[PDB]
Amino acid sequence: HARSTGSYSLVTQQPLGGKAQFGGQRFGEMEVWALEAYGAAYTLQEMLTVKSDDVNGRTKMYKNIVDGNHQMEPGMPESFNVLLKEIRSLGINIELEDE
Amino acid sequence: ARVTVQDAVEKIGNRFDLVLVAARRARQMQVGGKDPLVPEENDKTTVIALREIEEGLINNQILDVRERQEQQEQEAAELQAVTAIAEGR
Amino acid sequence: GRTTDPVRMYMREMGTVELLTREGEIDIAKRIEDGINQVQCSVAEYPEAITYLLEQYDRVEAEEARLSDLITGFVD
Amino acid sequence: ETLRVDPTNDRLSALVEIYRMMRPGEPPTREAAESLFENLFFSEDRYDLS
Amino acid sequence: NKKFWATVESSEHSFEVPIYAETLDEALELAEWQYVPAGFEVTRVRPCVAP
Amino acid sequence: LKAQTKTEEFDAIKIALASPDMIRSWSFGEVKKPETINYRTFKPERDGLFCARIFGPVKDYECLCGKYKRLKHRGVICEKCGVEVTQTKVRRERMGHIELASPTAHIWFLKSLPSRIGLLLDMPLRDIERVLYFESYVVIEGGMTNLERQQILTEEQYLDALEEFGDEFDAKMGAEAIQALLKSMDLEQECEQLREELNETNSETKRKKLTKRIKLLEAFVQSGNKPEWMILTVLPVLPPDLRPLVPLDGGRFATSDLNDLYRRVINRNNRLKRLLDLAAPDIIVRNEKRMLQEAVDALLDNGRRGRAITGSNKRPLKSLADMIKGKQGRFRQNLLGKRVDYSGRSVITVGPYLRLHQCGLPKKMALELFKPFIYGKLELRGLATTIKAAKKMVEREEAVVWDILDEVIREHPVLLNRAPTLHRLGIQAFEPVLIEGKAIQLHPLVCAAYNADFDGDQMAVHVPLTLEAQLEARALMMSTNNILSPANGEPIIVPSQDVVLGLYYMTRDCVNAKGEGMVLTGPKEAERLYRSGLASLHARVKVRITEYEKDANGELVAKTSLKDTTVGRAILWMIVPKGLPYSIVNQALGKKAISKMLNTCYRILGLKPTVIFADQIMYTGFAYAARSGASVGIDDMVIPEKKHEIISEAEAEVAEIQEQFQSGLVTAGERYNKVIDIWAAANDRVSKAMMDNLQTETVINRDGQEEKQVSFNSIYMMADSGARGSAAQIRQLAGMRGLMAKPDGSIIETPITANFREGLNVLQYFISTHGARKGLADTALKTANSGYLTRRLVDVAQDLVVTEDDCGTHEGIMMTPVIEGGDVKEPLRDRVLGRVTAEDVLKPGTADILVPRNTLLHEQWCDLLEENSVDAVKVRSVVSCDTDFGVCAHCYGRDLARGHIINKGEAIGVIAAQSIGEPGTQLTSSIQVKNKGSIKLSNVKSVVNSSGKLVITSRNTELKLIDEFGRTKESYKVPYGAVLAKGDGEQVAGGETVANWDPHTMPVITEVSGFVRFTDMIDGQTITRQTDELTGLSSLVVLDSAERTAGGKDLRPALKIVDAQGNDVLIPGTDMPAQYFLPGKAIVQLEDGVQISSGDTLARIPQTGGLPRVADLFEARRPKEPAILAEISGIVSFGKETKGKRRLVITPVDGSDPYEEMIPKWRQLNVFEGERVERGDVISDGPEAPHDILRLRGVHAVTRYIVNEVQDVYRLQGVKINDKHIEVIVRQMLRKATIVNAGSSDFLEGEQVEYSRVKIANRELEANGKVGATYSRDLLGITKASLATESFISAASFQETTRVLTEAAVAGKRDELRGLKENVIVGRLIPAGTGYAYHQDRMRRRAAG
Amino acid sequence: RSPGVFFDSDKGKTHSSGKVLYNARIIPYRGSWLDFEFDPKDNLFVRID
Ligand SMILES: [Mg+2]
Ligand SMILES: [Zn+2]
Ligand SMILES: [Zn+2]
């Protein structure tokens, strides 16, 4: 199996196979610990941000990919954002501060 | 294909700063800012940057000096333009 | 004690009231009549209450509103 | 020694303590505590070992 | 008003628990009266050294 | 400059309680209706859970009714139905609210374990819930009348009270009540009163509970939270796109359960408003309010209540709490896993042609993976008009795109990964080589680290998108850059099986073959001779070789000689580069030596030469292994000829013991043990037979008749080289296999007398089955256990990362060889290797500094230390490191995939845990000296007896063997009262008996001479009168105080040493006389008046393991029957007997206030009631609790205990784990400490040793001259130590989500990140490694100019 | 487990005492389970399901 950029999931924006075009491989907690141990920071960021969960990140990446510029403008993963809304839906006020 | 970055880790230590700096340079090329310091063997900007580290002609110090110089390279041309903005008084 | 489920809370809280005796139904309904009609008489003793009905009926025959809005039936 | 721990006395009291076990918190009734216990292990309908 | 550690044993293992008393024997008895009904065999009661 | 206004970068997430207005902030409208969609035109019904007016337009930049559909009109709110036209994405963002009629309690603050609403007012939960359900009233602001404030009343009571007091006394009921309580409450006043109260009465049960509460109060104040907010006025609704109504095939719909819940809450709320306007009776409005509370609860968290079920479905609807918590243990979407683009997978294949830096990547796969890059390059060169056309090109797969792809593949590495990722080597970077077919080709040498059999395992691939990811992969994750297991210095790239068999078959030598005896100049023609078939691969031939040595400073020497070697070894030498001596290839080259070759090559020539060396070794290995024609036949496994005989003889033994039991000569169990013993013995016989008949049995000839050497038998070559198989397994092939135990765990006395080469009949197989399924289950489960262990470990460490370069402390631990019992179980070299020195080491003669101060001890220095006699070195460790909130580089060490000192910023906690966890799968009379040397008696007091020997009068005693080099060889423990032929400073030979004793007896032996007297020994009370029946010599046996009669129970029996005069001979050199009391059950030897000498007995007293062991260790678990240690140094006595627990009174010789404990004397005592004992001495025996070691012995003592024990577990299984990692786990393990003395912070608290130390060190100077505070280091298990993390976002990962969120919310905690997990969650660069620089610069810019 | 009466032990781990226990269970093919069990004080207890 293989995939570059496929269809995604509605609830949480995440890679999902629609066409039997197999959704991306799962990157688990251990698989994260490996990158931690190595100390590859950007590999990790892009792994859980721009290559997966970041709704803007994915496309803003792809554009730079074809343009020959290898970079990332990561932003915030939709998982955490969804969690912000879910928590703040309760009587809990959770804000992002400073600058 | 640079098989071992050992000779590169030698020049600039810590081996993380290596990846960081060599990245900075590799983009100083891939984004068209400049051209290689050594024959490109078809090596991509990654390996070109690495080779540049091995030869000891590229590091944090060198890059910073180069860039800070370029800031003035632009200040020189803009010397007349930005000074003509005195209308702010 | 309270088994926590509101079903039993309500179930017991209501079961504290006795069934109405067949006499008591008429007694209570009578009390109702006394009260209501009393507030009605209280309305009738207000001059502006009458004047308003007149001022509105003036608008009814003036085609500025329908009868169905100002009344339903007389006593009849 | 089991009897010394037994809270109940007669058939009725036992049936009550049982009905307040199987369906705890709702008021126990005679017909209730009877119907339950009979319907558990003695009911041709609700029970069988085959 | 003082405090002493009470070691209570068990099936798979054993563990210590704080017991507050005045006398070592009072601590013993409080430890029994507390843990014994649970079936935790009482091993040793040590006064907290507090240097 | 101006601070800021709107969106920028951010840091420091804060969480706190919500306010009705703060809630009305995020709300862009109030949902007034339970309706969702129109039922025909699926457009949203306005003012409903789904609404365009409140939330957002259905389709992008298009208003609902459709008045403005153009992308031009954007910031316009429509006139018809106000919907501003903007991206439908904002329907995932905008929130809304609901205005609740009656106030409602927030269930998270009610039913949480520390019920918050409850302990804020100090009101019991049972009561508050009683009030909410309208079961009873509650007073508030009682004023001066009859009644307390928090006090509760009932119907008739409230009535009566009202009749008595109309005003000045207030009471409410329901949610409104609790709200009134919280609102009326004054925090500051309560604080003042609590202070005065704390101060008036002094009691432990009072002021502790008092201060504990005042703390929480003032904290709640400083938080910013107002108590009112605990009660819900307004309820925010989650955005619609987060709980969608979205369509589906078949016209059917699907929607989140949150819609059902919200619908219920809304409906009931409205019904309440109406019932208010209709002036319904009380019972009804109450019932309704209750129902609403229930609904709101079910929405927030369902299951603290009656557990509502979803519409026409039994399964309980998933509430918001479950939306947060997620499931599958504890993770929310950023831990357990996430789907990722640019990735793939497939079955893996071999590819021996590969170089260690590359891997075969399937053509189609590489096409699909790099598709975006391919597009770019394609239209970059101009082979494609536009991006669309490029897509059509690769969709067609036009012939040019293959070359276009071969462009992007060149310097762009790819990541490869296997299923059970354990240690960082589980994911590595390679260079793609385009290959036909659908299979991934993986370099065989790397097959070790991945733990990948070729049996159909599959490997995932990932593409390093951003440039930084490429350089990160190539300089770190690059396979060629990790040749060394991060756990231990040894090479992980070591040849595995086929290759080692090849090199074995070469480096081997036989007796007489082709070219035997001849001579050839170089290996160059030694290869020619073999290839021609004129010379055999293994024959002894003197040949010239030029070997190099780099001995000259930075410079390679050269020499040559006629070496006695073999044709094969000679040929093999052609690979070995430069500085390596020829002596490395002259051996037999087993899987061990073949590794040390590579290791030495790395530590000498550097990285590149080692890499290319390894590639070559693999190639030649496979080649010559193939040429070797090694195979496995059925006759290759040779069964001993004497087998059946051994079987028969042991079979005679069983019948002998059978006859014995038949005649009752032996008991059932005695017989059973005998039979099992002799059978096991037989098994050993057959085994040690087969190994011999297999090993050297090949007998051959050179020029003579017979000369015998090692066997050329295939399976033997395999087992000997280390290619595969082992003596233990071969044993099962040829010799009989074992005995089996029934599921009960009891071993059967009918072993398997047949082997695999023979037939195993029905029985033997059936009996083997249990052991089989048991095995499979065991390993399959221990996999999961290993995983769990690793998880706890990474949780307890994590954020620990190298921070400071050098902390500069002289503190460290003393590294010495392990010296386990008879002989060394691990050398000093491996222990100190790769580490740094704490201070200058000295030659036996001083004034000379071998290794100065702190210097990394590398191979050369370790060698220098080995040149001299040095028996130990002070080493700096992570556990002793002065660095606060991290570890300095100099303290950690070198070890890594590289030999250089640790890099600044690498995450040590992670690698430590991973290293400890990778091997986790694999797991379960008198002293006689061995070597020659001298005698050392460590910590001993003794006396010379009348036999001219030496007897030990001390409990703790050691015996060290000090050889002529001065370093230690052996170490032993010599029991009290032991006779020695030698003494301290004497000389012994190999196998000379030094210590001698009786294991069954605890002698009372005296240190002086004189007459024996009986003091306070009376018959019928203290002593019982008994005479020996086997001899007739009688002794008065001492009676224990758990038995004795009335008057003599309180009297301790003693044998007091006197002299001829009737005086008292004292203890040598003291004011104290000599009287040695007697214990219970102890039978005396000599009677009253009889004379004795030194060293003579006054009397004689009678008498797990595996992975869970490691777990119990790291968790600091207290064992079942722990040995008890003396609390305080001093001489200890007995008394009071009370209730079966004997009292032990330690009498200090120095001070006083002798301390007494109650020890259950049913346990056998190791101490002496008449003897002094130092603190932390054995008063008994058995495993000791870690807490004890820390509290009594010391920090370094316990830090040594842990590492030594866990290492004792691993090293028994053949596992190499450097002490470092375990030491970091220890450092985290003891991190917290408890304060004893005051003067800055709280008294009994649990604060961090790092925080403390920074505070007191801050207070040792400046401040107050010293107001500083004393603490006590504490030992917390890893699972417990992981519990404390400053970051709450981190805590929400592993811990219980609900609790953490609430507990942090009330305090208004501010999570600043700074850690790994907390950053990974929010998707920001890891504050370590490549990003440690970023987080550093950011941290520095923060809280500064 | 076939319907009928079942006499178990459950020694060891229970209560740490070592006095063991003895439990019986009547499991039908359908309907409620009838359990009888002892305790450390040798008091005979019964529970449905
Ligand atoms: Mg396998
Ligand atoms: Zn409109
Ligand atoms: Zn340090």
Curated annotation (Swiss-Prot), chain C:
It comes from the Bacteria. It is found in: Cytoplasm. Belongs to the sigma-70 factor family. RpoD/SigA subfamily. Sigma factors are initiation factors that promote the attachment of RNA polymerase to specific initiation sites and are then released. This sigma factor is the primary sigma factor during exponential growth. Preferentially transcribes genes associated with fast growth, such as ribosomal operons, other protein-synthesis related genes, rRNA- and tRNA-encoding genes and prfB. Contains 4 domains, connected by flexible linkers. In the active conformation, the domains are in an extended conformation, each making extensive interactions with the RNA polymerase catalytic core. In the autoinhibited state, sigma-70 factor domain-1 packs closely together with sigma-70 factor domains-2 and -4, contrary to the extended conformation that is seen when the protein is part of the RNA polymerase holoenzyme. Interacts transiently with the RNA polymerase catalytic core formed by RpoA, RpoB, RpoC and RpoZ (2 alpha, 1 beta, 1 beta' and 1 omega subunit) to form the RNA polymerase holoenzyme that can initiate transcription. Identified in a complex containing RpoD, the RNA polymerase subunits RpoA, RpoB and RpoZ, CRP and DNA. Interacts with Rsd; this prevents interaction with the RNA polymerase catalytic core and with promoter DNA, and as a consequence, promotes transcription from promoters that require alternative sigma factors. This is RNA polymerase sigma factor RpoD. It comes from Escherichia coli (strain K12). The chain holds residues 92 to 167 of 613 of the full protein.
Curated annotation (Swiss-Prot), chain E:
Keywords: Bacterial host gene expression shutoff by virus, Bacterial host transcription shutoff by virus, Host gene expression shutoff by virus, Host-virus interaction. This is Bacterial RNA polymerase inhibitor. GO terms for biological process: symbiont-mediated suppression of host gene expression; symbiont-mediated suppression of host transcription. Interacts with host RpoC; this interaction inhibits host RNA polymerase activity. Disulfide bonds: none annotated. It comes from the Viruses. The chain holds residues 13 to 63 of 64 of the full protein. Acts as an inhibitor of bacterial RNA polymerase by interacting with RpoC subunit and thus preventing promoter recognition by RpoE. Non-DNA-binding transcription factor that plays a role in the transcriptional switch that abolishes transcription of the viral early genes (class I) by the host RNA polymerase but allows transcription of late genes (class II and class III) by T7 RNA polymerase.
